[PDB]
Design a protein around this ligand. Sequence first.
Ligand code: 8A6
Ligand code: 8A6
Ligand code: PLG
Ligand code: PLG
Ligand code: CL
Lengths: 442, 442
Amino acid sequence: MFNNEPLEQIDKELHDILADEEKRQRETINLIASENLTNGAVRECLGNRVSNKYSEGYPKKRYYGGNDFIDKIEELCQKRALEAFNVSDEEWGVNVQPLSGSAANVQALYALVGVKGKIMGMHLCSGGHLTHGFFDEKKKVSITSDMFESKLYKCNSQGYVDLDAVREMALSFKPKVIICGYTSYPRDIDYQQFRQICDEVNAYLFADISHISSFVACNILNNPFLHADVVTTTTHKILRGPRSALIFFNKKRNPGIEQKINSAVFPSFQGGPHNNKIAAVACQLKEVHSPAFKEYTQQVLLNSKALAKALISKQIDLVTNGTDNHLIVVDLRKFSITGSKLQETCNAINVSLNKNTIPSDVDAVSPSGVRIGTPAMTTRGAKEKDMEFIADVLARAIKITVDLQEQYGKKLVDFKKGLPGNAQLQQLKQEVVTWAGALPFP
Amino acid sequence: MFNNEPLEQIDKELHDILADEEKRQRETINLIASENLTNGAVRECLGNRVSNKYSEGYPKKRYYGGNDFIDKIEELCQKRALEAFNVSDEEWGVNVQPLSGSAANVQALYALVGVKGKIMGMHLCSGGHLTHGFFDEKKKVSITSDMFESKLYKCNSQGYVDLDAVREMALSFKPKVIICGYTSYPRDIDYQQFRQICDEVNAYLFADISHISSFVACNILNNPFLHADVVTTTTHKILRGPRSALIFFNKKRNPGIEQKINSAVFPSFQGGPHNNKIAAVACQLKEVHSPAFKEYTQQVLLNSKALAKALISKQIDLVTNGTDNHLIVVDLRKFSITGSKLQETCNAINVSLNKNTIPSDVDAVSPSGVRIGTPAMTTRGAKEKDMEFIADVLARAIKITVDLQEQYGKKLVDFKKGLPGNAQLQQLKQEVVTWAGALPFP
Ligand SMILES: Cc1[nH]nc2c1[C@](c1cc(-c3ccc(S(=O)(=O)N(C)Cc4ccccc4)cc3)cc(C(F)(F)F)c1)(C(C)C)C(C#N)=C(N)O2
Ligand SMILES: Cc1[nH]nc2c1[C@](c1cc(-c3ccc(S(=O)(=O)N(C)Cc4ccccc4)cc3)cc(C(F)(F)F)c1)(C(C)C)C(C#N)=C(N)O2
Ligand SMILES: Cc1ncc(COP(=O)(O)O)c(CNCC(=O)O)c1O
Ligand SMILES: Cc1ncc(COP(=O)(O)O)c(CNCC(=O)O)c1O
Ligand SMILES: [Cl-]
């Protein structure tokens, strides 16, 4: 007693919009630092009937029965996860149930500190996440600033983490958790020094490595696992998995942490796991461990370095004057345009990037940069030599933006009026579509 | 720079377990009240490349660009949702971003009351959810009893909501939210009397209709939308959708609620939505509105009534002595066996059901019932006449359970020892597998 006819027949209206979405992705230079493209195997898992199963609890300690094949899936996911990040299952545990990165962080913080507990993270404006304690004068914007008592440390005027300030804050504020690992930070992190501060104050060290996970896995950047009590990561960014997350906890350094984190995930916050997600994560975590994926991750860094260099060669400034990872933050002040304006221009030409604050922006009302990253275009086969074209396109867009602002004014309402029907953008859009459209697409 | 080998080739180990999981679902009489089987169209959506897109915020108010087709999908999902539950978009709004039921509820509760806010829900043991404020004297088990101050009302000795108790408690406790709608409640709810109590104390009315959502939609049961401030529902149980959830909020009764709920979901709790989920929900909410799905929902009720009646005809007792909805709770005291024991027996015969507390249970360590429901088996094409066979299988399992307890003792360790190799269970399993295997399968 059900309908079995395909999506195209069952719901033509939805299928058209989806096929358009697919056309837009195929014909876009995607530079969103946190985005990637899943292969067809990850997506076969996500559409698997394993999501019919209610399997609350954990393997072998399940509330319901019928869970033998689910238990093997979740266990194959935890194992593949600890292996992928080169940690021993005797020293480290992992939870594979968090539904996304924000959930994973809120659950992990709760486990460590509880309600009213004190936390320290990087301010949003300097490159931290919303879930690292973010608030405004006007509001406790993240539950992490409301259910917990948070204090935020800023980067310096050059965009680097200021460890002397983190200490100044940590010693006076006395948090139980200090969060490092960030959303738009173009450099590597000094975890040993974070660990040194956390010891002085008796705090936990929490590393959120969602943006740099593949670099940590493949041994290309610093290893937070040598120093952290807790490491979280999303599975969908550079890792190229499904939308999901992982919480790692150090058993050796804190026995009884396994119970705290597991119980924080369920039943404190979640109910039934999404086993299609867990399967998909298993599938990608296998690919992660292969030598082919290390080559991909290496290619991501090489592209990022070449893109930075090509941008610098065209007199464009970068926060920290370069990158050690997959992402670049462009400082647009010298052209006297906002990131908000350049995003709009880049949209008009099928270039996806996002506006991003730089250290000299006091408010975040109007950020003065944009964030770009290479994992998505590296997945589509772009090599170092293709980065000059991407830089060329970005430089042409910055220039068009400057032209449009002269003609239409500095107010965003007015600026956008210039965007439709500009001949240069249509020319450039066309060039983007031809190059993007022919690249491999999983 | 990716691997596009299919799942079977790319990862043979995972694919084996999945196909096994598939076979077990096909060969099981599934009576878990909260489970169902998604059609191929819902599952195509879940495997769609739309989950590559980061789309933080809400339609027309996104942080990033390239979100035009995502905006159409999310807007179509909201529209189809409001329509399905026969509410005007002028008076009701809906948020379609919650990743699951428990998230939906913690988010909605937070929006209404905030941290340290007072809430009232049905105790777990009486049929409420974990997220309705569940705690133990030992521990604040749900985040809903820790980030909020919760009070729990019990059902009477017959399994019914005692409204006089709800008023006694509401007048003295003075909560700002009272939660109704339940996880194992076999009867319809008197929302008007809840609304009367809520007005009497100035509290909000929160209806969680996850288990009865289709009955509310198809106009078979009482309509909470006539009386509630907030209605939440999962999309994966009787509704037959993906694993996701919906928060409905009454604008007319509460101007300013829309901002509170929307901001509670993001950026308070969540980050990026899962667009494959939102797509999947759109796809199912269209099926929901059709008359064919009303025929399904009616068939669920007819099967549930026939199953209750066939169990009574075999001298098995039910909590509340019957059902108004899709689920039954069997009281096993007269056979001197625990639900825990009957679940194990039913597992051995490919009958999925779950143990469940009854009013006479105090400790909750060993519950004296099992909960069964009909949505899953109704989706597989069972009709009223088929419920006699299900009732006969369940009565035989109860009897075998009784026989095993006498031979092996009343301790669960010992009981299990009797289970493998028992000729009657193997004969009964065989019968189940044959009947189940032949039923239609989406
Ligand atoms: C969206 C998001 N999530 N996590 C991230 C980012 C971005 C980010 C967040 C925000 C943000 C997100 C939420 C708030 S808010 O306080 O919650 N509120 C909604 C303000 C508001 C009120 C009315 C109308 C619009 C906005 C405030 C700021 C803003 C930006 C922008 F570029 F606009 F300045 C960027 C970024 C990667 C998109 C980022 C930065 N920079 C980093 N570090 O982390
Ligand atoms: C799993 C779950 N989620 N929401 C639901 C249900 C069930 C439920 C929850 C629980 C439950 C879930 C969590 C806790 S706990 O306090 O968090 N903790 C894990 C202590 C513990 C540890 C080991 C053994 C017992 C207790 C306590 C009890 C127990 C049952 C049982 F049948 F055993 F009594 C049932 C049910 C649908 C499975 C249900 C009932 N009855 C209803 N009303 O709501
Ligand atoms: C460091 C970090 N942690 C957690 C999250 C949350 O993941 P979910 O979106 O799955 O909740 C993000 C997402 N950051 C968004 C971006 O960089 O575009 C992140 O950058
Ligand atoms: C009334 C109610 N509300 C919320 C939820 C939470 O849904 P998620 O599992 O998607 O978090 C449940 C699940 N109850 C589980 C069961 O009846 O088997 C529920 O019964
Ligand atoms: Cl999903």
